[PDB]
Amino acid sequence: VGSDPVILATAGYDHTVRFWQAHSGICTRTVQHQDSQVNALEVTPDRSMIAAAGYQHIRMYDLNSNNPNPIISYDGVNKNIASVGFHEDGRWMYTGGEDCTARIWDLRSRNLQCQRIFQVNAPINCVCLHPNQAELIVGDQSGAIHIWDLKTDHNEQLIPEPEVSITSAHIDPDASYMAAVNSTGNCYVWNLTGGIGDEVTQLIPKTKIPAHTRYALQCRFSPDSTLLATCSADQTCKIWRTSNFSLMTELSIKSGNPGESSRGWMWGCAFSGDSQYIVTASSDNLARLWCVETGEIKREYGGHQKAVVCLAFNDSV
Amino acid sequence: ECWIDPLSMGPQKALETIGANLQKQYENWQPRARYKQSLDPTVDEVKK
Amino acid sequence: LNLQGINESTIPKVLQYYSAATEHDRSWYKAWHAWAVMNFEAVLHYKHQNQARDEKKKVTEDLSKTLLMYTVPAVQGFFRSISLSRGNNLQDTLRVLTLWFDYGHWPDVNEALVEGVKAIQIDTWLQVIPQLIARIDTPRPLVGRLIHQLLTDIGRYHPQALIYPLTVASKSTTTARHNAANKILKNMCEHSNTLVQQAMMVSEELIRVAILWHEMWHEGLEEASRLYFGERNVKGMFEVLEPLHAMMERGPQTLKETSFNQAYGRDLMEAQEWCRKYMKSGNVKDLTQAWDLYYHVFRRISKQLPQLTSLELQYVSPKLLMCRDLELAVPGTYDPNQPIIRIQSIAPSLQVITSKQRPRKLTLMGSNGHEFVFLLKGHEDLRQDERVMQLFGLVNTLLANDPTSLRKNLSIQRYAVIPLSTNSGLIGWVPHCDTLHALIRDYREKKKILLNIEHRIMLRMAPDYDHLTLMQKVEVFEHAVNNTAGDDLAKLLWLKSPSSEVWFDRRTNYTRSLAVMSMVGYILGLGDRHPSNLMLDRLSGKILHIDFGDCFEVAMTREKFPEKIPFRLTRMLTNAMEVTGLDGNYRITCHTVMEVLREHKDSVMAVLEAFVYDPLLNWRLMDTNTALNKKAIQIINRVRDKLTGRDFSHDDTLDVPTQVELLIKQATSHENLCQCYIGWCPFW
Amino acid sequence: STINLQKAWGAARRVSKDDWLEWLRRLSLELLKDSSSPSLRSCWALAQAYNPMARDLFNAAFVSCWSELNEDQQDELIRSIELALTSQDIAEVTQTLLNLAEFMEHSDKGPLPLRDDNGIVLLGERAAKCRAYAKALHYKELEFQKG
Numbered sequence A: 001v002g003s004d005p006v007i008l009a010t011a012g013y014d015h016t017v018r019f020w021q022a023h024s025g026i027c028t029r030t031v032q033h034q035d036s037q038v039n040a041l042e043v044t045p046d047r048s049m050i051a052a053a054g055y056q057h058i059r060m061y062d063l064n065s066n067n068p069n070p071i072i073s074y075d076g077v078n079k080n081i082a083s084v085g086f087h088e089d090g091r092w093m094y095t096g097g098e099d100c101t102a103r104i105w106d107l108r109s110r111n112l113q114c115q116r117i118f119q120v121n122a123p124i125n126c127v128c129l130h131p132n133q134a135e136l137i138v139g140d141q142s143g144a145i146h147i148w149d150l151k152t153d154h155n156e157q158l159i160p161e162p163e164v165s166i167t168s169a170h171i172d173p174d175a176s177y178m179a180a181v182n183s184t185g186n187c188y189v190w191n192l193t194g195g196i197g198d199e200v201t202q203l204i205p206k207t208k209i210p211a212h213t214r215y216a217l218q219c220r221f222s223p224d225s226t227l228l229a230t231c232s233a234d235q236t237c238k239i240w241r242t243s244n245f246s247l248m249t250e251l252s253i254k255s256g257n258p259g260e261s262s263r264g265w266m267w268g269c270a271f272s273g274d275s276q277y278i279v280t281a282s283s284d285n286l287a288r289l290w291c292v293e294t295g296e297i298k299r300e301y302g303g304h305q306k307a308v309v310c311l312a313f314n315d316s317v
Numbered sequence B: 001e002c003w004i005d006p007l008s009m010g011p012q013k014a015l016e017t018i019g020a021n022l023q024k025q026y027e028n029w030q031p032r033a034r035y036k037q038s039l040d041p042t043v044d045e046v047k048k
Numbered sequence C: 001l002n003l004q005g006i007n008e009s010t011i012p013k014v015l016q017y018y019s020a021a022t023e024h025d026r027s028w029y030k031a032w033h034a035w036a037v038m039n040f041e042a043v044l045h046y047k048h049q050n051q052a053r054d055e056k057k058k059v060t061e062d063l064s065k066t067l068l069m070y071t072v073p074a075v076q077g078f079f080r081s082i083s084l085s086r087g088n089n090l091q092d093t094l095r096v097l098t099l100w101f102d103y104g105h106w107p108d109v110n111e112a113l114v115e116g117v118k119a120i121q122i123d124t125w126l127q128v129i130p131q132l133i134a135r136i137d138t139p140r141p142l143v144g145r146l147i148h149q150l151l152t153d154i155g156r157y158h159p160q161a162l163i164y165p166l167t168v169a170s171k172s173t174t175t176a177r178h179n180a181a182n183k184i185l186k187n188m189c190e191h192s193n194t195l196v197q198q199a200m201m202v203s204e205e206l207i208r209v210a211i212l213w214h215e216m217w218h219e220g221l222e223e224a225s226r227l228y229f230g231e232r233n234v235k236g237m238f239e240v241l242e243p244l245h246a247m248m249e250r251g252p253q254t255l256k257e258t259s260f261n262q263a264y265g266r267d268l269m270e271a272q273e274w275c276r277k278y279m280k281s282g283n284v285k286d287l288t289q290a291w292d293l294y295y296h297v298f299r300r301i302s303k304q305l306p307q308l309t310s311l312e313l314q315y316v317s318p319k320l321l322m323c324r325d326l327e328l329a330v331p332g333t334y335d336p337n338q339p340i341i342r343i344q345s346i347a348p349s350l351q352v353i354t355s356k357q358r359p360r361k362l363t364l365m366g367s368n369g370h371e372f373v374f375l376l377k378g379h380e381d382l383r384q385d386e387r388v389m390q391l392f393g394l395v396n397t398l399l400a401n402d403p404t405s406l407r408k409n410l411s412i413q414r415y416a417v418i419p420l421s422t423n424s425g426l427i428g429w430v431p432h433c434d435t436l437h438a439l440i441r442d443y444r445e446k447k448k449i450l451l452n453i454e455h456r457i458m459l460r461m462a463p464d465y466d467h468l469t470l471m472q473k474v475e476v477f478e479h480a481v482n483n484t485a486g487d488d489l490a491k492l493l494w495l496k497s498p499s500s501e502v503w504f505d506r507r508t509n510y511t512r513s514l515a516v517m518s519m520v521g522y523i524l525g526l527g528d529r530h531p532s533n534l535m536l537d538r539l540s541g542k543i544l545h546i547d548f549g550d551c552f553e554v555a556m557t558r559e560k561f562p563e564k565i566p567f568r569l570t571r572m573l574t575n576a577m578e579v580t581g582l583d584g585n586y587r588i589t590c591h592t593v594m595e596v597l598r599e600h601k602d603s604v605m606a607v608l609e610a611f612v613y614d615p616l617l618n619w620r621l622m623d624t625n626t627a628l629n630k631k632a633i634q635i636i637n638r639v640r641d642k643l644t645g646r647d648f649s650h651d652d653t654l655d656v657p658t659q660v661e662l663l664i665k666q667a668t669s670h671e672n673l674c675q676c677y678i679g680w681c682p683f684w
Numbered sequence D: 001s002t003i004n005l006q007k008a009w010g011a012a013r014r015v016s017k018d019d020w021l022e023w024l025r026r027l028s029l030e031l032l033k034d035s036s037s038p039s040l041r042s043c044w045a046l047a048q049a050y051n052p053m054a055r056d057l058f059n060a061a062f063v064s065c066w067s068e069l070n071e072d073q074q075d076e077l078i079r080s081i082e083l084a085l086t087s088q089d090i091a092e093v094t095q096t097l098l099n100l101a102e103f104m105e106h107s108d109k110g111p112l113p114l115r116d117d118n119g120i121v122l123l124g125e126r127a128a129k130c131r132a133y134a135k136a137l138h139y140k141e142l143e144f145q146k147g
Helices: B011-029 B043-047 C010-024 C029-055 C058-085 C090-103 C107-119 C124-134 C141-156 C163-170 C175-191 C194-210 C213-231 C234-248 C255-281 C284-307 C318-322 C383-401 C403-408 C436-446 C453-461 C470-482 C488-496 C500-524 C571-576 C585-599 C601-613 C618-624 C628-644 C656-668 C670-675 D004-009 D017-034 D044-049 D051-056 D058-068 D072-086 D091-106 D122-130 D133-146
Strands: A008-012 A017-020 A040-043 A050-053 A058-060 A072-074 A081-084 A092-097 A101-106 A117-119 A127-129 A135-138 A146-149 A166-171 A177-182 A186-192 A203-210 A216-221 A227-232 A236-241 A247-252 A277-281 A287-291 A297-301 A308-311 C310-312 C343-346 C349-351 C363-366 C371-377 C417-419 C425-428 C433-435 C534-537 C543-545
Touching: A008 A040, A040 A081, A040 A308, A050 A081, A081 A127, A092 A127, A127 A166, A177 A216, A177 A227, A186 A216, A186 A227, A236 A277, A277 A308, C010 C029, C029 C058, C029 C090, C058 C090, C058 C107, C090 C107, C090 C124, C090 C141, C090 C601, C107 C141, C124 C141, C124 C163, C124 C383, C141 C175, C163 C175, C163 C194, C163 C417, C175 C194, C194 C318, C194 C371, C213 C234, C213 C255, C213 C284, C234 C255, C255 C284, C383 C403, C383 C417, C383 C500, C383 C585, C383 C601, C403 C585, C433 C436, C436 C488, C436 C534, C453 C470, C470 C670, C488 C500, C488 C571, C500 C543, C500 C571, C500 C585, C500 C628, C500 D133, C585 C601, C585 C628, C585 C656, C601 C628, C618 C628, C656 C670, D004 D017, D004 D072, D017 D044, D017 D051, D017 D058, D017 D091, D044 D051, D051 D058, D058 D091, D072 D091, D072 D122, D091 D122, D122 D133
Parallel strands: A166 A216
Antiparallel strands: A008 A017, A008 A308, A040 A050, A050 A058, A058 A072, A081 A092, A092 A101, A101 A117, A127 A135, A135 A146, A166 A177, A177 A186, A186 A203, A216 A227, A227 A236, A236 A247, A277 A287, A287 A297, C310 C349, C343 C363, C363 C371, C371 C425, C417 C425, C433 C534, C534 C543
């Protein structure tokens, strides 16, 4: 799990966190997660320990050692933890909850209490750390995106569309474009003005892509920053090319038969180390390693009793 | 039944109450005797 | 006014106009009503501009002259617009009360009111007897003296309209209310005396029936256990129990009270000895002996309470059994036009309903010969329901007046509500009704369908349903809805109906009645509409709403399990309507109801403002909060926005079709439905 | 006890109103005589004397008979019901058999299957000519639900 270069964790409602192998497709070890589901996993850049954000506790399991109890159990929160970030230095940890109060957690510090707080109006659905490690993008249920600066605290509130819950938002590693996604199924792309010291961070609206008919769930750029995968509740994981904003490949898990209701929502999109493959979790209890160019299920992971809401993927050498 | 309306008191309580009153009534004539009620008894219960 | 608005320059102009209109047509109702309401708005405009400027010596003295300049015209006008209407003066009469209560302490406003009260007929005030008695103890002497004198004359003609609320006031806890009520009763006695004695007895006996000793001890020991073992509040624990000891210190007044004091009373008195020893010693071993006795009787009571299926008058209250051919009339039947349907006799048996609160099923025989069934609720304040029924009466009047509504036969089904104390009161039992939950239960047991099938499917798919995120909940909820045919109510409405011709009429009535109460409930703010709180008339097909405990968006305000659904528009109700969907009868009916209410916004607003501001009903707003005046003002402002259609966005006014469409989307939205507490049953 | 029944089913030689009305009377009285429940069988003599008595027990006689029949007689009967409604339809006979189909819907047994789909199309067309627009609507809503 840890010693293996690639990591592929998986977790859902069944209270487990199963660490698979990409080359084989075999469950190496499970880890118990009682009292709640898991809303979002996250491998640390250092790769020493995974994270597992749940209900009123951010747990962090060991990646190297096998069958261990949670190393960290950050308590003192309520109404779930939607997401978790991680500072590339490995000192700070970010979270987002439904209490309308962003936070920052010092892993190195032993204090249970958090460090900073950025209260907002509506519950925070998703966090995303800007690659410069200075700005913290924060979505909410009212529609207002924010950019809480990590040095000046100057949040630049912005509402792409009034009264639509923005469910996910990502920014590519090269800080070129930032994408956002809402429960209507649009994909508001924003062109990042090139400011670091000035921290202007002006968001220029480029294209509203009419990505899906029904609720969209997650978007994420590739490490190449050429492709933008966009998942939704229509059982299709579309992949949009960043240059032309066109549908290069449409990965669908539909039945191919009109008599099949609610097969399962698709909310997984993790690019490979080189953007050749793409892992994808679905609510049909099955992970699926897709191929980006062709669009073929290379490997399928099964064994989860319940739905699969999270993924983890780490090819960091 | 034994000067007690069973449907007034509800089923279970009424059955206990009638057994108690019936004991008292008998105790008017023979107050020094071991009474042992059986209320909707089984066969073994009657045997023992 | 529509072009310019209300401000310093328009008011002198629009008064010149309305005055001219009044001059050119004296007899014309609308000319006086418009003049009066305009003066009254000129009062509240300068009052709120004073608080906006002066609050945020000479200015208040100028404001005295300024408002009194507009108050005396308003009063004279409302009194003249009452006589002209002769049957549609509710709005005007309440405005008179609002003016009287606020400014009537002034000599000049009092004088105008005195001359007005003389001129106006005494039958008009019967509408607003609740609102009068609410201010029976007004600290201002000049106001309160004229209230008494008015009530006196309401006593001398139509005393049946007064005895019930007066008897409730006469036994009020606060001293000033009961003093005023007794002083008025002293005057009422001379005319009749028989009515006062009868109603005082009947009401005392009904209260005794409504809450028995073992029921009071049960709720008292539950509260005292939560204070002691939960909060560790020992002094507050004695405050709960010491009234119950003083309650029994009267003694056994009935055979049930005799057998209680026989069985338990000895143990309670012994536990009181340990409590009184603790008060002067302070020992844990002393008080634990009392809690042993308290939990001994509590367990015995808890075992008894299921067996109390019925109460006989001979045991519980023989006074009521003796009662024959009382002159005191049946509650909520008295009409000044109809002949008094006085109480013939009370039935000997009381079918106690097996619920959480254990309501009774009182039934009275009328002198006309027809039986009148009631529901005797205990420890549930019914003054809200009484006021809400006054609102429904007004709305029914408005729909009757509108021709479109009259042609469609739109109306709200309402029932009698008669409070007896702060805790208990009588509710009129609606016959041929049964709750939606019962109907669905009985249909699903007949068809061998699991009652909790949708809930079981959710917990099967995701056992952490309560703790799931919003998107996760929507998936699970939709998966349940797609995998359950939500047609149980439509199907059972068919099977129940004898013939198709009747079925169609039942369904038309059902759809229209539901739409009417959806819009009215939205404006009133009525939440907590789970299927146990609405019942369906098995003959007319009309829907009935009960238990209006939550009002003014309390459900949205409360942190725990907040409800974001304005009115209940679930899939099962939609299926019960026409096959096409809400687009047909439901949508068209909503437009008509909304248009009429918007047209008569002033009448609706006047009624709503009066009861909300009432001190007796202020408690509900204070509980909702986390001063009291500010909270009430905000609630009134929100309701006004709903009538205008600016509720969704203050900046942009919305037309009736647009407003209705937005409301439907919010009610039917999957995201909003999932959040709702599971007990609300968002899947039926 | 299915010889006179099969004559009343496969006759279809009726060219007037009173001819079908006679078929109805013969059908009702044969169902009463047949009926297993003796409370109904006892009313057969009165029904012959009085027409209203026969018609009031029509739905109950039918259900009693239709339950006993071992499927083969049910098809023989249903086929005859189809022919009577489809051809030589008489207003009085129709609204009798429409009230029979509605009574059968309310029963636990379920609607009689005639020409597939419980005759949702035939009974609707027939109720339309009978001017029973509430039955017509109900049936036309069932058809809408299917597609």
